[model samples]
Target: DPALADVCRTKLPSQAQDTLALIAKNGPYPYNRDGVVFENRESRLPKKGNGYYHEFTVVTPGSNDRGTRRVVTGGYGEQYWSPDHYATFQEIDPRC
Candidate 1:
């Protein structure tokens, strides 16, 4: 586990917020890479069985490629943001 940021919803970048909204919509993603299974191979986040999580891309406005931003959602209603790819993660929880 890593150091948790106090809260995620208020701290999330706008792009990430939009992506999370799209996640709730449940499909029709803008990127081809979106909605893919996110295996916690790095042992990051809580360890869980396969299919428990999936990921979505957070657009980097000025980037040429996908860049290093993503939102991972847990099957049982949890949201996570990884600005630096999978190196670290912060949850999108308002509860703190």
Candidate 2:
């Protein structure tokens, strides 16, 4: 498993932190799609079964609609950050 320190929490935007807080609390998430299953069809992350990943929105500072940034969580507690709407991802240490 990846360690918390492996992710540079300070490098993440503030909204990403807020999203993390909501996740930790099991949310009243900001979007209806927030808890929806994340289909890893692009084969970006390691392979996993269907429903193994869920996605959450990371609010954008001045965007009127839901932005492209997201936080995806795996069934086993792994998390990933995607800034470009799932085109790419980076593992996130959720301990922050």
Candidate 3:
């Protein structure tokens, strides 16, 4: 519900923004799972067809594996921020 707000892309951490840039170019991700199709299983995000969304790692600090933070983009060209592995999904406005 509250995750629907449109905010600045910079609201996300620098590492998250970096991932966005990487996603834009299409290659060289920190984790193998990055860029994979997001199932939206939690149903936290708006309902969409399969493969309409893709997920990427946000590259957080202090972790042996990929951190909890992540960046998910939809086919509609919207970005979603999750600081807790989909526990808190927030849409952002990159234009701002």
Candidate 1 ranges with C-alpha deviation above 4 Å: 1-3
Candidate 2 positional error at 35, Å? 0.6
Candidate 3, residues 11-94, lDDT tens digits: the string is: 778888898899888868878899899999878898889999999988878777766898899997888988899887778778
Once superposed on the true structure, which residue ranges of model 3 sit more than 4 Å away at CA? 1-3
Winner by lDDT: 3
Ranking under lDDT, best-scoring first? 3, 1, 2
Candidate 2 lDDT by residue in tens digits, 71-95: 9999888778888898877887545
TM-score of each: 0.88, 0.86, 0.88
Question: What Cα-based lDDT does every candidate model obtain?
Answer: 0.83, 0.83, 0.84
Q: What are the per-residue Cα lDDT tens digits for candidate 1 across 73-92? A: 89888888888988978777
The full ranking of all candidates by TM-score, starting with the best, is 1, 3, 2
Task: Return the lDDT, model 2, position 76.
Answer: 80
Candidate 3, residue 43: the lDDT equals 85
